[PDB]
Amino acid sequence: PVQQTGGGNYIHVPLSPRTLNAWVKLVEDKKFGAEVVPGFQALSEGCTPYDINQMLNCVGDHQAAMQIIREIINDEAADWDAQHPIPGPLPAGQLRDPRGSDIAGTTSTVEEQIQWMYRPQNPVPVGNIYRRWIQIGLQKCVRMYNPTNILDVKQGPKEPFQSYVDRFYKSLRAEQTDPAVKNWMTQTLLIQNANPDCKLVLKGLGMNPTLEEMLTACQGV
Amino acid sequence: PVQQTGGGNYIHVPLSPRTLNAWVKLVEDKKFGAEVVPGFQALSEGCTPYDINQMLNCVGDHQAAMQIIREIINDEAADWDAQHPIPGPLPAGQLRDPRGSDIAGTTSTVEEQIQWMYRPQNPVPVGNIYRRWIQIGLQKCVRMYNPTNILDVKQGPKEPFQSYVDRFYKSLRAEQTDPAVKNWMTQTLLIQNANPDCKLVLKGLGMNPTLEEMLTACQGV
Amino acid sequence: PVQQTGGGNYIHVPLSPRTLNAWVKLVEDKKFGAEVVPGFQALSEGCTPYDINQMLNCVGDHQAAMQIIREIINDEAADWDAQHPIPGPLPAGQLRDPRGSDIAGTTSTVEEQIQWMYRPQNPVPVGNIYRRWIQIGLQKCVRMYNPTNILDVKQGPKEPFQSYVDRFYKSLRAEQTDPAVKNWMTQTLLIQNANPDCKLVLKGLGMNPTLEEMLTACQGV
Amino acid sequence: PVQQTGGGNYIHVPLSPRTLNAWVKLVEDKKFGAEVVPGFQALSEGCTPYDINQMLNCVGDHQAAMQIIREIINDEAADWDAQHPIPGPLPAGQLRDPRGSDIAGTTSTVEEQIQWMYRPQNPVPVGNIYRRWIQIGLQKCVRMYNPTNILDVKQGPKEPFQSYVDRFYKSLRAEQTDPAVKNWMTQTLLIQNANPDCKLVLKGLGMNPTLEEMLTACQGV
Amino acid sequence: PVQQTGGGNYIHVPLSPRTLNAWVKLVEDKKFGAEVVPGFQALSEGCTPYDINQMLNCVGDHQAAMQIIREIINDEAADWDAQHPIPGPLPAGQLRDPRGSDIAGTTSTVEEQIQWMYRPQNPVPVGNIYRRWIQIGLQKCVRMYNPTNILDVKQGPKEPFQSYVDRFYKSLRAEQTDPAVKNWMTQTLLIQNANPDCKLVLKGLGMNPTLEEMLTACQGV
Amino acid sequence: TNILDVKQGPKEPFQSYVDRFYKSLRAEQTDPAVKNWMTQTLLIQNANPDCKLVLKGLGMNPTLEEMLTACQGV
Ligand SMILES: O=P(O)(O)O[C@H]1[C@H](OP(=O)(O)O)[C@@H](OP(=O)(O)O)[C@H](OP(=O)(O)O)[C@@H](OP(=O)(O)O)[C@H]1OP(=O)(O)O
Ligand SMILES: O=P(O)(O)O[C@H]1[C@H](OP(=O)(O)O)[C@@H](OP(=O)(O)O)[C@H](OP(=O)(O)O)[C@@H](OP(=O)(O)O)[C@H]1OP(=O)(O)O
């Protein structure tokens, strides 16, 4: 992280143990639950990359997924190098313009990552760009770990409509589905993959019911 | 959240892990108990919307209810857009006047949400307006989850008048009932849905007893 | 709560989660033990009313007692309105003189509650007056929940004089008894409601023994 | 407690929940172990009396002992009133010279207790004097609760000399014994109340052994 | 650690208990897991050597490994002494130029270690150089404790391809293997040491599959 | 019929099925994005297991042209 000073220059405060441990305990307990994606951001809102890397590295389990995230950061990295050019030999006295690897803090140092993140001429935040990339690797894994696809989430003889709708929506977000499909699935597949006795009551409501109405109606059916 | 500086402009401090976890542990343990509504406010008294959204999102369970809250924020959102007009093309150099979605921080950024929340000309607090909306979705769910309606809370042969009155009042607040009804239910339905032996003693007190008198009298009856 | 600033006006800091939880865990575990009364004050020494109300409200159990406290705050409230007059239409630009409900923060806002609590002309602390009222409702409940009245606390064949005196004094404070009665009960009823074998030894000490002497003497009797 | 300010007067910071709870958990678990006396001081090094009283009061158990402490504070209190005279009617504008009860903060307020504790003309610390008194009541109780007197701490066939010496010294401090007696008991009663086989070996060392020598020698005897 | 002051010189703040305990609880629970290496750095980002030494020393178990680390710090130490010369008798008034042992803080004091770490003429950070050395001793131990070598990590009849790849990669990093070998092992030995039924499906993908494809394909095979 | 009910018969080709699917996809006036998801997924899910595995062996995000050729005589 970065803490500024009065009469002094910006300094690098370290990351904190509690936070390093919470991220570790949100991935080893929730088994890369979708929520892992925001937990990470919040725990990292103001962490320079060197620190983000130390956190992800403390986790020595689910190491296949972490490798997948590393592959994704390198692929996104290639795009930034291609789209952003080299101004040419940059005159000594100037910190090298940032690349996808310095953004990570691998080849670069925290002090240089703070320098770009705050340089007055063109501040390049090498702290938030990296997290975004990590979040695409985390998100794919969540999608690789939705044990049930939404088309298979249905209702058994003794399964109600409140637990089923919970199992459905939780998967729908984790599949990283788009919005229009979300509504169609929400207004149709919810009723299709259900017990018939409750289905008749959800259909008794009328057309385009609301989740409030669907839930209240099928209370005890 | 927002922390101001001396010699510097307002900055965005992040939300804290402990608080993100407490909200999560007040919803997964109390099963959206009514108290969830204030716990949220207190945990969020000074959180800009971006953060309020990160908290609600970390919870990946009870996701049906969270969807209901999202529907409610969008419905209230339509009202604000209708009631509050567009001054027209706003001259470049001016931050767009706030809408129901920027209030959420979805399409907007925290820096802009802080800018309106503190702009000197007409400070628009986009932090408290949003929470209020979230609280109406949370409140409906509590009402959707009062397992017993107050008209069904009664006294069995071995149920006393202290546990029953507790089960009654807890439901009365969670039903989000109005005040005049609250008093009538309080002075009448409490005695009606009760064991007769205790009922005779509560009636021996006189007319319009006080909960102190009702409770002390039916001690052991 | 209220935190003052240098070069800036007083601000409202929020209440803290840990404290909201401790009050909740001192009432759901001690079952409104007498100590609940001071725990509250200490946890609230510098909390503006809006916050005191949020804490009491997070507790959704023992809700009958909380209603009793609400009745007591309204009754005390009537007294303040009667004793303190209305200076008449107060000129615009002046915050309304405080009433029993603003003291609670119900109809009022924290900023106005801080304004009176610190107004230079006649600072009206709307923070401590309210707590005092809450403490009379809490105290009555403790008295409504002393399972044993002091006149019934006695000694059985295998009950000693150290556990009995503990059960006696704990009730004596919770009954909210007065001081002169406290001494008479202390020097007389302690010996009366006791095992005879120990009674003879407590009486062997002489007249007006001291709890030190009474306790040391009946060691093993 | 008291926190001073720059450009402002001294203020009263409150006591903290964690500390109120630790004192409570050092008395309900250690059953007024001697260590309770220092735990209290350290937890209270800078607490004005009002707070010291709130802590002791949160403990609603072992209430006989707390009453004994209250009797002791009143007895010491009489001595201060007798030894320290009344300068006579003190001119309005002057805070009353402190008495044993204001030192407690009972009849007095924290602001007045801070005023004497810091008054420039003759600062009277009403914070440390009170604690000292509380410590004499706590100490008597520890002495009233040494289950074994040192003259009864001895060695059985299978009791060694390391556990016995531990049981002996722990009692010796809790009896609040004097120093000269401490040495005689230490160099004599330790050997007297012991197993003979180990006694012969402790005596083989010579005269006035040291606890290092006594302990190393009787290793396995 | 080191905290600077305004109007005063740099001071040595101490290390914190929680951190001393976390390092101890990351080595006695993870049994020198590879992650121990970064946990240490993060917990020590800004700790002067004297403190780093106090932490490692609190751990009294796995003391063979700590001795190995001590041997490694002494061997690296010899290199620094050889490569860095003695400018000769350094004039009194000048702190001795740093050596490998002062870097540790053994023969040196924290104040001198802070003086070099911040001396304006040629700041020598004796805080980060030491940690680096400790990290080579920690890393060797992790390699001495990879119970399974990657050439022995294979798939049994009921072992899938997700747990196996996890056991493989975790070892690959802990063996401290190089990058080119990492890719060859990754694209070849992963398929070789596997169940044949899944092997046929991983081979059905084509050539140079990606861990995403390999993992999705062998789902249920 | 409807697209969430259309299913390839056990001894029916997945070709007969696609003609009973795209015909019912346009009729339902399904949105274009909802069309792509149903197209790349709901076809394979509501199909014979043998051809479902054969199209799954075809690879990721297959194209209908390839799906038809691979499930030929499947
Ligand atoms: O008291 P809190 O500030 O909420 O902190 C709690 C816990 O509280 P309790 O003692 O009431 O259970 C302990 O706090 P401290 O006593 O150390 O202040 C301590 O527990 P652990 O060491 O077991 O984690 C840890 O706080 P800290 O960072 O101050 O050590 C943290 O633990 P939990 O979050 O697990 O309750
Ligand atoms: O951890 P933070 O979120 O920054 O909170 C700090 C921090 O809490 P911890 O003690 O749990 O680390 C301080 O740490 P220390 O200075 O004790 O190391 C503590 O200081 P004090 O206990 O000395 O006051 C202070 O305490 P408090 O909550 O009583 O103000 C507390 O404050 P916040 O939680 O409000 O930030």
Residue numbers in the entry:
A (entry chain A), B (entry chain A), C (entry chain A), D (entry chain A), E (entry chain A): 1 to 221
F (entry chain B): 148 to 221
Q: What's the paper's own text on this?
A:
During HIV-1 or HIV-2 infection, the capsid is a necessary component that protects the viral genome and recruits host factors while trafficking to the nucleus. The capsid is comprised of approximately ~1,600 copies of CA molecules, which oligomerize into ~250 hexamers and 12 pentamers (capsomeres) to form the distinct fullerene cone. In this study, we leveraged the approach of templating the HIV CA lattice assembly on liposomes, together with stabilization by the small-molecule host factor inositol hexakisphosphate (IP6),75–79 to produce regular HIV-2 CA lattices. We report the first high-resolution structures of HIV-2 CA capsomeres in their native mature lattice using single-particle cryo-EM.
A cryo-EM map of the mature-like HIV-2 CA hexamer with C6 symmetry was resolved to 3.26 Å resolution. We observed density for IP6 in the central pores of both HIV-2 CA hexamers and pentamers, with clear density for R18 side chains. Density for a lower IP6 was also clear, though in the hexamer, it was less well resolved than the upper density, and likewise, K25 side-chain density was more modest. As had been posited for the HIV-2 capsid lattice, the central pore appeared most similar to the open N-terminal β-hairpin conformation of the HIV-1 CA hexamer central pore, despite HIV-1 CA occupying the closed conformation in the pH range used for HIV-2 assembly (between pH 7.5 and 8.0)85. However, considerable details underlying this structural plasticity differ. These differences also compound into identifiable changes in CA assemblies, with the central pore diameters expanding by ~2.7 Å in the hexamer and ~1.6 Å in the pentamer compared to HIV-1 at the Cα position of the R18 ring. Specifically, we observed an exchange of polar contacts, as the hydrogen bonding potential of helix 2 residues Q41 and E45 is met by either Y50 and Q54 in the hexameric conformation or N57 and Q54 in the pentamer, allowing a change in register as helix 3 slides along helix 2. In the hexamer, D61 and Q63 of one CA NTD form interactions with residues of the adjacent CA CTD, K170 and R173. However, the loop between helices 8 and 9 is shifted in the hexamer structure to allow Q176 in the CTD to contact residues Q139 and R143 in the NTD (bottom left). For both pentamers and hexamers, one of the most striking features of the map when compared with HIV-1 was the stronger density of the CypA-binding loop.
